[PDB]
Scaffold this active site. Sequence first.
Site, PDB file in Angstrom:
ATOM      1  N   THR A  11       8.286 -43.683  23.727  1.00  0.00           N
ATOM      2  CA  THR A  11       8.106 -43.055  25.031  1.00  0.00           C
ATOM      3  C   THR A  11       7.297 -41.767  24.960  1.00  0.00           C
ATOM      4  OG1 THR A  11      10.103 -41.708  24.934  1.00  0.00           O
ATOM      5  CG2 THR A  11      10.322 -43.988  25.853  1.00  0.00           C
ATOM      6  N   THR A  12       6.801 -41.416  23.775  1.00  0.00           N
ATOM      7  CA  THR A  12       5.854 -40.301  23.644  1.00  0.00           C
ATOM      8  C   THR A  12       4.603 -40.812  22.938  1.00  0.00           C
ATOM      9  OG1 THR A  12       6.537 -39.489  21.458  1.00  0.00           O
ATOM     10  CG2 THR A  12       7.797 -38.704  23.369  1.00  0.00           C
ATOM     11  N   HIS A  20      16.281 -36.404  25.073  1.00  0.00           N
ATOM     12  CA  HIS A  20      15.451 -35.967  26.194  1.00  0.00           C
ATOM     13  C   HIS A  20      16.396 -35.448  27.261  1.00  0.00           C
ATOM     14  CE1 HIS A  20      12.053 -38.358  24.497  1.00  0.00           C
ATOM     15  NE2 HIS A  20      13.057 -39.117  24.094  1.00  0.00           N
ATOM     16  N   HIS A  35      18.306 -40.851  21.697  1.00  0.00           N
ATOM     17  CA  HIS A  35      17.604 -41.948  21.029  1.00  0.00           C
ATOM     18  C   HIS A  35      17.848 -41.908  19.532  1.00  0.00           C
ATOM     19  CE1 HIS A  35      14.565 -42.125  24.618  1.00  0.00           C
ATOM     20  NE2 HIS A  35      15.693 -42.764  24.873  1.00  0.00           N
ATOM     21  N   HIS A  59      17.064 -37.949  18.413  1.00  0.00           N
ATOM     22  CA  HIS A  59      16.646 -36.840  19.254  1.00  0.00           C
ATOM     23  C   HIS A  59      17.180 -37.066  20.663  1.00  0.00           C
ATOM     24  CE1 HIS A  59      13.506 -39.960  19.529  1.00  0.00           C
ATOM     25  NE2 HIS A  59      13.528 -39.651  20.814  1.00  0.00           N
ATOM     26  N   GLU A 105      15.329 -40.896  30.324  1.00  0.00           N
ATOM     27  CA  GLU A 105      14.076 -41.630  30.427  1.00  0.00           C
ATOM     28  C   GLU A 105      14.299 -42.971  31.116  1.00  0.00           C
ATOM     29  OE1 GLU A 105      12.214 -41.188  26.338  1.00  0.00           O
ATOM     30  OE2 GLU A 105      11.052 -39.814  27.629  1.00  0.00           O
ATOM     31  N   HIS A 154       8.509 -30.725  21.017  1.00  0.00           N
ATOM     32  CA  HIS A 154       8.703 -31.702  22.103  1.00  0.00           C
ATOM     33  C   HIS A 154      10.184 -31.943  22.339  1.00  0.00           C
ATOM     34  CE1 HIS A 154       4.430 -32.552  21.683  1.00  0.00           C
ATOM     35  NE2 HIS A 154       4.619 -32.926  20.429  1.00  0.00           N
TER      36      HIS A 154
HETATM   37  N1  LIG Z   1      11.291 -41.286  22.375  1.00  0.00           N
HETATM   38  S1  LIG Z   1      11.274 -42.607  21.294  1.00  0.00           S
HETATM   39  O1  LIG Z   1      10.548 -43.890  21.976  1.00  0.00           O
HETATM   40  O2  LIG Z   1      12.761 -42.907  20.719  1.00  0.00           O
HETATM   41  C1  LIG Z   1      10.266 -42.116  19.877  1.00  0.00           C
HETATM   42  C2  LIG Z   1      10.658 -42.389  18.575  1.00  0.00           C
HETATM   43  C3  LIG Z   1       9.851 -41.981  17.527  1.00  0.00           C
HETATM   44  C4  LIG Z   1       8.681 -41.303  17.818  1.00  0.00           C
HETATM   45  N2  LIG Z   1       7.753 -40.832  16.825  1.00  0.00           N
HETATM   46  C5  LIG Z   1       7.944 -40.888  15.395  1.00  0.00           C
HETATM   47  S2  LIG Z   1       9.517 -40.138  14.884  1.00  0.00           S
HETATM   48  N3  LIG Z   1       6.772 -40.208  14.863  1.00  0.00           N
HETATM   49  C6  LIG Z   1       5.525 -40.952  14.940  1.00  0.00           C
HETATM   50  C7  LIG Z   1       5.547 -42.296  15.284  1.00  0.00           C
HETATM   51  C8  LIG Z   1       4.384 -43.049  15.349  1.00  0.00           C
HETATM   52  C9  LIG Z   1       3.173 -42.449  15.080  1.00  0.00           C
HETATM   53  C10 LIG Z   1       3.145 -41.103  14.748  1.00  0.00           C
HETATM   54  I1  LIG Z   1       1.285 -40.190  14.340  1.00  0.00           I
HETATM   55  C11 LIG Z   1       4.311 -40.351  14.671  1.00  0.00           C
HETATM   56  C12 LIG Z   1       8.312 -41.035  19.110  1.00  0.00           C
HETATM   57  C13 LIG Z   1       9.102 -41.446  20.150  1.00  0.00           C
HETATM   58 ZN   LIG Z   2      13.055 -40.506  22.534  1.00  0.00          ZN
END
Ligand SMILES: NS(=O)(=O)c1ccc(NC(=S)Nc2cccc(I)c2)cc1
Ligand SMILES: [Zn+2]
Length: 257
Positions: free
Chosen positions: A195-196, A93, A116, A91, A103, A61
């Site tokens: 945001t994912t 985007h 982020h 990371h 975003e 991703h």
């Molecule tokens: N794009 S963001 O809003 O900064 C963001 C930050 C962290 C994540 N996911 C983390 S690293 N992994 C994760 C988090 C919650 C549940 C699960 I299953 C995996 C996913 C998105």
């Molecule tokens: Zn992010």
Amino acid sequence: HWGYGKHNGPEHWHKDFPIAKGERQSPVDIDTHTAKYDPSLKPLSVSYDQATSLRILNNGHAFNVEFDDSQDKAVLKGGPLDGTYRLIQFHFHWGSLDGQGSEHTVDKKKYAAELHLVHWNTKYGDFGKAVQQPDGLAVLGIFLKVGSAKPGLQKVVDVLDSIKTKGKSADFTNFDPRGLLPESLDYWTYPGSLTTPPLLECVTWIVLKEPISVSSEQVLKFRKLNFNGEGEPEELMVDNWRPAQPLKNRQIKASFK
Ligand SMILES: NS(=O)(=O)c1ccc(NC(=S)Nc2cccc(I)c2)cc1
Ligand SMILES: [Zn+2]
């Protein structure tokens, strides 16, 4: 599985993650005339001098640079936050073109990319517990525009060849995230979400007003990464961004007049 394509992108996510249409979803548009200055906001405290980076991972991703968060080495505090948040990873985007990729947007303006830096609240003991809490995460967002190159980014750019496809990782020690920050720590802040997927509503968003500049050659190498695994048809890793979501019953606060 979810992604960013026509058939599994942001418009599809709600089907497996109903919270996609929730009350504090991210990202959002930052309307600079509607955001209110909040004199009771404290200065941000970014303490990254003892940070320990470990690894860089293509997770299909984006790519993550991961940190040792088993101690208070790199922490975020102050601003709108109570308590200590440990850096776990950062990371990006980014877009297929320089005119899109961030975003968050500012008065509907899209930046070329967005960084982020992800932090979790130490009062919940680990990251997995923290994402289950309304104040569990603090993510520091930083806009990228294309212009002069960012020297502090080049180490990252140069390793991307070795993690071209999904699931590949590379050793990435002794990286200093302080080289990714702008001069000013002026910010906007609002309550939101990941945001994912799973889009958990567990994030205090802190978005810096001042963008950093990166070169066209630097963002170009972002765009040479792959969504797919090795030996699979190549799909370029581009436009891995979710668009702005309805603000609803929230206010964006500014740290600055
Ligand atoms: N794009 S963001 O809003 O900064 C963001 C930050 C962290 C994540 N996911 C983390 S690293 N992994 C994760 C988090 C919650 C549940 C699960 I299953 C995996 C996913 C998105
Ligand atoms: Zn992010």
